[model samples]
Each structure stands twice: as structure tokens, then as C-alpha cells.
Target: QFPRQCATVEALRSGMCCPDLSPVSGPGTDRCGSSSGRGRCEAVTADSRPHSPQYPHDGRDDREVWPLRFFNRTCHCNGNFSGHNCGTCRPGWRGAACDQRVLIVRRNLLDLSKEEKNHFVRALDMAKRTTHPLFVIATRRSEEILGPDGNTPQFENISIYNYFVWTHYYSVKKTFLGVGQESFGEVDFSHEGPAFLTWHRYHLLRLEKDMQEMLQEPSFSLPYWNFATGKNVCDICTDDLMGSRSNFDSTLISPNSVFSQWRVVCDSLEDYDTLGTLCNSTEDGPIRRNPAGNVARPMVQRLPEPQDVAQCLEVGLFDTPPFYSNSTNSFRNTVEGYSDPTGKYDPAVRSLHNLAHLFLNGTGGQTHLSPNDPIFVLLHTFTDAVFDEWLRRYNADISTFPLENAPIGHNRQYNMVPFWPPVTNTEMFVTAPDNLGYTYEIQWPSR
Candidate 1:
């Protein structure tokens, strides 16, 4: 959840992450390329307003008010210069000067050429195996960050992909009330709110950025899975794409696919809750995914129809009052699958994004474990694509997004939880092509 340089005992004690750009050094050393006028260290600004009380336990969850539990000071990059140390260029811009316009177009997974598909698959596996060169995850909550010994920082090295998994787990994990007490399971910093689309949108962006750096292919783009085919089959589940169902076990991934060999992190939810510990870098077990395989839930056995997408796109309002999972007739709720495609509140119904996830029936169905399945990356991209499409169709802005009293960590100005450098929800609430420097190559389902 932080850069390696900032995970040190000194850094944690100092409550600062402004490592010198050296670009490193002794006392008067400039932090965050500030000496060169690139960027400077500053106190982080977090929304300290009254939250909607969806997360009622005050000061219990480490994610409350965000980042403050860790570091209050961080590097605020200027212009296109960005990163934990202001050492890199922002997305859509590159070069030493950081002044080039580069737009990466995300395309459908099945549309990719065989070689492109292979490259995408290989990149994902590489990320799964590659040690994250920059960041490390905090294995303990902030209150226990210094460890029992006090000086021992509780950070651990995690692979690039596992780091991704850890973040999702961290955001959505239940808040441990106390030892032997019940955990507050309703609290989720990442989901069940307006930030759902924005949070996952940034999630994909983070992975794409990491994969690009890993492959040294700055133009690399993440492919999407259009899961709204209204079919009961997993089309991309093959040796070439995402793995197929195992011959022996219906839930296990087939050996022919590289994803079959992939192990998951953060599988021990009971340990995390019982021991009051967070998911560490311990990679355990294979991803369990069976598309359209939830036998008991026949409603979810079939994917959302194309018309589901058409109707969801018709939801003009971004989100309604309460802005929680119970939010009704709101586009955010509709795409999130809490509401029907026609923007009607239906507790018994699941359509669009929620339907897509539930249909996976196993790993992808569970929120915290979803990203462990590689198809989650593709699935969320399509959901984001739908979000982008809605933004374009309605021409809506953040004006409709809640400024206060939404869910905790979902206010318009609130920085999304667990993302380093603190990007706000509103920052991602723009048209992708013109604002975020990427566009989806999608043909929206229509009447």
C-alpha cells in the first residue's frame, strides 16, 4: 500500500513519504524532485466531513478518513510529473519532459489477434510472478504498524499482481471490532457506493500502468471481456484465453491454460477476521471459477442479455440519495447491479455488473477474492467501458455525484482507499478519451 522507500522505520516514525529525488541523499536533500521544481512534499488533504454512517464505528477501521492512519505527508507532483517520488510522468503523458499526448485504446479480449492475446496473457503471468519493484503492502493495521517491538514496520514485499489483490481485500474487508467480538461486516471502503465505478476504473488503470512498465511497452492496453452476451458459456475460457474448467473438478481451472498454474493470495478470510490480521503475501491455492456454474442460483446461470446493457445505459441519473447499495433508479446502482437495468430497485434481481460477477459463481462472485481470477480484470474493464459509455450518453458530470453524506470514502473529493498518491473519485469521473487519455473501442448494445 506504499512505496518501498516510505515503508522504512524512519519514514513511518517521521510520518512522511517525501523521499529525495537524488534524486536521494543527506539532510538538505530535496524531496520529491522539489529542488528541480518538479514537485514538493505537502500535507495530504482528506475529506474530514461526516460520512453517511454506513461505516458507523468511529476510529475502528484503518481506512476511515483514509491515508491519515499511515502518512499525513506525501509528494504532490506538479504538472505531468507524478508517482510516489515525482519520478515518473502521469498516465497519457511520457518522455523526460512529460509533455507528450498518448492515448491507449482498450479493446475486447476476443478481438485481439492470437499473438496479442498471448502477449496479454504472458504479461499478466509476468506481473503475477514479478516482484513489485516499488511498492510493499502493510500486513498490519495502522495501530499495529510498528509491530509489537514498536520499531519493526509491518510491511511485506508482494508481487505486482498480489499487491492488486491485497488492495481489493484491504478495501472491502470487514472492520474487526475487537478480539472475540463481532466484525462490522457492512463497512467497505471500495464497494456499495458511488466510488464503485471510479474505484474499479482506477483499479484497471493501475494494473495497465504496471503491466506497461513491466513489458516496457508503454502503448500496452488491457483487453476487456464483454460478459453481457446473454449466454451460459464462458467463451474466453480456453487454453488460449482464461483457463477452462478442469476435467476432474468442475470448479478447478484446466491445466492447459497458464492461469491454471496461477495461485491466489488472501484466501484465508477466516484467519484475517479471527486473528484480526490483513492478507499478507502468502500465495495459496488456485483460483476457483466456473462461469455460469452456480447450479442452485439458476437466475445467475445465464449472463446479462445485450438488452440489459441498453437499458442500463438509459439510466440518466448517476446516483440517488443514500448512495448505498439500496440506492434506487440510479445509473451507479444499475451498473453496479444493485438495481434493475430499467433503474428499478429489486432486491431479488441482479443484472449488469453484479450479474456478471455472480454468474462466475466462485472466486469472481466473492468481492474480495474476485480479482484473484484474471477474468475479473477483463470483466471490470467492460463494466468501466459501460461507465464510460454512460458518461458519454448522458453528458453527466460530478455535479450529480455526492459531495457529502454519501458512503464513507465516496464523497466527491474523497481520495479512493488504498491507492498510493491519493487519487480522488472526481478525478476519474470524466470522459476517458478527452480527459483520462484512453477510450474504449466498444459497440454499445442498442434497441
Candidate 2:
């Protein structure tokens, strides 16, 4: 989950990711673009929040504290400079000196022009075929990262789109307790926590940026899916878009769309957990998505209503104490589909984001396999758009967010799991147009 430059054996041993922007193999060289005055290598700021006892064996897993096992040192960029090496501009800034402001507006999928929609689809297909320029995924745990031969690194190359799916699975996978013991069920670094919104916000940004670079179109942006249409049908699941249900098989995608030809990664959860190996970049089967097709689960037969969005936005608290999935009056928990849209936690109820996901009834319904479906991209963007609006409405402060006593990965200063260069939830909490270089073209339904 780091740059190729820092994913070396030496880098892993040293636990440092600060790379020399221009290494000359000499003294007085700035390790983090210090000469250009863009950034500096500094000690990482970890989340010191007092976590709940839900996770009893913290030291057993390398991901417990996050980045501590991977890299204890990181680049602290300055004046719009971002990335692990401080060589790139921040999201909103683009120029020689990283001074030019650029705002990418994200619109509804239905709102896109015919040509724009085609371009978007083509870019996604390209990402699926393109090898990532930097970074490789680990096939084994940190201790066994060195292969049995001891010379070969346990890393493997993954395609851009597959890498996206792998990261989500890595974060949500149960913590391996021991060889024969059952993995912990309650521990999730990415979901059911306060970091859910921020983690996904950065997740989408990474994919958007990767697609832009892949297509050589820096202006390309991801579109949103308003899944809260209060209808049983998936509006974007047309043959021209994400693909419709196959006439022959209820589970397969229609052949008319390119997405129907696409394959999914991280499909073998039991194998990975049982063998204690990570998911490799291997494709197995087509994405199975049938919106409102779960005839067995009648509750998920229909998507959420627009009014659910209005109700969750009214939550005053960004999150609550003991900020796990059980949090109440928490916008995060509500939007995550744990609590009702009215900010109340109900064990039997699923609303908003979770409901939208379950409504898919197949690949998009399950957390581990969700990203395999292209609809996840649009679904999460709309979730993030709602998050941005909440940030704007409340003028949320970083201090108001939990710094400690939240779930393991939900703290403000906690570096998001499975992301390279180590970005924190606080880093993504700012207003989009003001800091993130993107804005949503959405109209909020009145409460």
C-alpha cells in the first residue's frame, strides 16, 4: 500500500517511506523535496485515541495500529505539494508551482452526455487492463513477506481496477486470530466506523485519479448514482451503462454492455483466510448484479427514498462516543446504513447506503465483492457527496471528530488502511471545493 519507490525490502525493514525527490547519492540532499521547499520527511502522527475493547488482541495483527508496521515515517507536504515523494500537486492545485486551482465537478450519471458516458465507460475498461505504474500488493502477511526462497519479495503486480477491489477486501477482512482459530468478526478497519466516509472518499479519489492518468485525461471525473430513487429498479443498470440483467440468466449481466465482459477480483474469501494469503490480481467470473432481484430477502427488494438522505443530513453529530457500528445519533453510522435515516440505531433496520447496497442483491450486496460491480463507484460517490454536504452544513471541525475511543481505524489522526502515502481521516474532512478540488452537482431534497 505504498509507492514502488518505497515498497522495497529495505524500505519495509526500515519502516520509512520518505523518498529523495532528486537523489544524487550525496550528503545535504533533502529526502522529501526539502531543497524545493515543497515538503519534509517527518515522524508519522498516529491515532492515540483510546479504542474500545472490542479488539482484544491488538498486537497480534500488523494492521492493528496501521502504518506502524509498514512505515513509521512519511512525507509532510507543503504549499499544495502532495504524494509520498512530494512531487505531485494536491487535488485542487495544478501548475508548475502547484498554484493553479482546478475544481472537478461530479454530476449525476444520467446527466452525462452520450459522448461523456461512452468516454467514462472506455476509461474504466482501460483501467481494468492497465498495470499499475507503481506499487505492488503483498501476497503474504508482513512476517512472511519474504518468500520461502527468502530472496523473492512476496509482492505481485495488480491491474489498476483490481487493486481497487483488493484494497477494500484487505480492510474489511476479518483479523486472523491464529492458525486454527476463527478470525475476529467485529474488527473492520474500513467499514462500520467513523472513518467509513473519509476512507471511501479517498478510495474514490484514488480510482478517479488512476482513471484520469490511464486515459491521459486529467479532467475525467466519476459520476454519481442516486440509488435513493424509491423504486425497485436500478436506473443505471441499462445495457448502455453498467449493464442489465441477462435474459437467459437472472444473475449474469447482459452482453450488450462492455461491463458484461469484465471479470471480478478478490472472489475467493475463504481461500485467502484459510491459507492466510492475500488476494492476488486474478480474475475468475463476471460480476453478478441483479438489482431488486433477491426474492428471498423481501426487505431489500426496493432502494432507499430521497427523503432518507434529507433525514440523515439533519444529524448534528458527525459521530458519537464508542464510535463503532452501534453508534447512535451519528451521521456516519446512519449514512453507513447501520442506523436509520432519522439517526436512530435499529438492529433489524437497514437504510440509506447499506440498503442501496443490499438492494443490488448480488455482487454489490456483499461488502467483500461489492467493488467488483461498477455501480459501486457511482453509489459511493453519492455517499461522499452527501458527506461533503454535511461538512459544508455543519462547518465540522477536526477536534469535534473522535481522536480516541473510537473504532481502531475511525480516529481523526488514524491513517486510512490499505492506502499508500498514509492519508488520515482528518485530511479528507475539509470542504470539497475549498480543499479537495471537486464539487458535486446535486440538489438536496428538503426535510
Candidate 3:
């Protein structure tokens, strides 16, 4: 959840974790590559707004204020530069000086050519095997991070794909109370809040960035699955792409696809909840996908419609008061699939994004295990495309995003959980091309 530079005892104690771009460089250099006027060490800003009382024990969890318990100071990049160190360019821009303008159009997966589909599948498999060069995940809480010998840091190396899964698990994981007590169920750092869109936005960006790095293809971009086509079938689930259902078994994947051989991570929910341990980089069990298999629920049997996207975009407010999953008429909640597709609040209904997720019926349905299936990568990219369209229509305004009283990590200023270098919701609220360096290639349905 933290950068490797900040994992040390000294750095943690100092509360200032400005990583050097070049580790070999001696003293008297700029922190976060500020010598180039990219960024410098700045004090971290946590959400000071009043939070909803849904979470009773705030201090009991390490993610309470998000990264405050880990580090109080971090690099704040300027212009198109972003990362723990200012060594990398923001999304959609790639150059030695971070000056070039780039555009990566996320297209529908079904629209890709036969060769393109094979290349995308192989790229995902490569990411699953490649080790992350920069960061490592903490396997224990800060209190228990030191080993039994009291010297070793409780961190472990993770693959790019497993890191993606681990972050989702960490965000949705319960607040571990103690040895014998049950973990609290009322809190989630990522979902059911105003930050859901922004959080998942950054989540997809991280994976895309990681995949780009792993493949050494800076121009590489992820494609999307338009789950809102109002069809019960998974168009991208052919043997050529994300595997279709096995003819022999419903939950099993077809052996004809490479994805069927792929194992999953973060599958042990009971172990993590009871033992109070984190999900390490371990892979097990084949990806279980039963798309449109929820016969018990007819509503989720069909995916969302194209008009659902049009309807959610009509929401004028980004999010309403109490900013939880239940918020009505809030664009975030509606697109998140908690509210009705037409921007109406209904506890009984699951529409749009949520409905698409539940339609996967198994791994893709659950929040924690969703990313294990590669389809999540495509599913969320489309969701983000809609968010980008909203920003464009709204003139990239930040006034509607709640500054305070959002669920824990939903505030505009709160740093997204488990993401190093700490990206705020407000930072991600801008239109992509002008500010963030990327633009979506999408067409909006007529109103």
C-alpha cells in the first residue's frame, strides 16, 4: 500500500517520504525530481470534512484517514508528471520531458481484430508473470509489520496482475477488530462511496500502466466491454478472448482459451477474515465465470442498455449528501449500479454497472474477487469512459464532488487507498485530454 522508500523505520518515523528518482545519487539533489520543476515534497492533505457515522470505530483501522498512518509527506507532481518519484509521465502523455501529447482510444473488445484479440490475451498473461519493479505490498499491519525477530519488514513482492487483485481486496476487506472479534462489515475504502468512480478509475489506470511497462509498449491501451448492450450474452466471452463457459460444466471456463489455465488470487476470504492476515501474491484455482448464470435473479440476466449510459450521464449532481452507496440521484451511485439506471434511488434495484457485475454471476460478481477475471479490466474501462464523457459535458467542474462528509475515502481530498504516490479524487476529476493526457474514443447516445 506504500512506496518502498517509505517502508523503512526511519522514513516512517520521520513522516516524510520523498523518494529519490535515482537511488544511486548522493545527497544535495531534488526530492521527487524537483530539480526539473516537476514536483517536490509537500505535506499530505487528508480529508478534514465530517464523515458519516456509519463507521463507529475509526481509529481501530489503519485506513481511517488513508496514508496518514503510513506517511504524512509525499511528492506532489506538476503538470503532466505523476508517480511516487516524478520520473514518469501521466496517462496519455509519454516522452522524456513529459511534453508529448498522446491519445489511447479504448475500443470495444469485440471490435478488435483476430490478431488484436490474441495479442491482448497474451499481454495479460505476461503481466501475470512479471514482477513489479518498484513497489511491494505489506502483508501485515504496521503494528505487526516487523517480523518475530523485530527487524524484517513484513512485505512481499507481487506480480503486476496480482497487485491489481490485492489492492481491490484491501479496499473491500473488513476492519479487523482483534484476535477473537469479528471484522467490522460497515466500511469499505473504495466502493459504495463518492470515491468509487475515481478509485476504480485510478485502479484501472494503474493496471494499464503496469501492463504498458511490462510489455515495453508505451502505446499499449486496454479495450472495453460494452456490458450495457441490453443483451443476456457475453459478446467478449468467445474462445478467442476471455473464455466462454465450458460445455461440460457451467462455472468452469472452456479449455480452448489461455484464460482457462490462469489461476486466481485473493480467493481465500475466510482465511483473511479470521486470521487477520493480508492477501499475499498467491495464485490458485481456475477463474470461475458463469456469465448470465444467475437464473435466480432475472433482472441481472440481461446486461444494461445503451440508454442506461445516457440516463446516468443526465445526473447533474456528482453525488448527494450521505454519499454512501444508497445516495439517490447521484451520478456516482447511479453509474456504480447502486441506484436505478435512470438516476432514481431504489434499494430493491441493481442497474447499470452493478447489474453488469452481478451478471457475471460468480467471480466477477463479488467486489473482492472481481479483478481476478480479466473481464473486470474491460468492464471498468467502459465505466470510466462514461465518467470521462460526464466530465466533458460538465466542463470538468469540481464543485459537485463532495469536499467532505463522503464515506471515508470518498472525499475529494482523500488519497485513494493502497495506491502509492497518493492520487486524490479531485486530481482525477478533470477531462482526460486537456489535463490527464488521455482521451476516450466513445460515442454518446442521443438524448
Candidate that would win on TM-score: 1
The lDDT per prediction is 0.87, 0.85, 0.83
lDDT of 3 by residue, 24-88 (tens): 55852778888888888999887667666653554667887778888888999898787888889
Native-to-model Cα distance after best TM-score fit, residue 369 in candidate 2, in Å: 1.3
Which residue pairs in candidate 1 collide? Answer: none
Clashing pairs in 2: 49-404, 50-405
Give the TM-score (vs. native) of candidate 3.
0.94
**lDDT (Cα, 0-100) at 107 in candidate 2:** 98
**lDDT of each residue in 1-447, candidate 1, tens digit only:** 999888988887788989777644675387988988889999999888778864346566778777888889999999999988888898788898799888999999999999999988999999999999888998887778889999898989998899888889888887876755544537677788899999999988998888888889999999899988889898989989898899989899999889989888889989987787889998889889888778788999999899999998888889999898888888999999988899998789888888988988888888889899988899999999999988888775667788899878888888899999898998898889977779989897658
Q: Please provide the root mean square deviation of candidate 2 (C-alpha atoms, Å).
A: 1.9
**Residue range with the least summed lDDT across 10 consecutive positions in model 1:** 176-185
lDDT score, candidate 2, position 183: 48
Ranking by TM-score: 1, 2, 3
Tell me the alpha-carbon RMSD of every candidate: 1.5, 1.9, 2.0
Q: Which stretches of candidate 3 lie over 4 Å from their true place?
A: 23-30, 34-38, 179-185
Error of 1 at 60 (Å): 2.7
Error of 1 at 347 (Å): 0.5
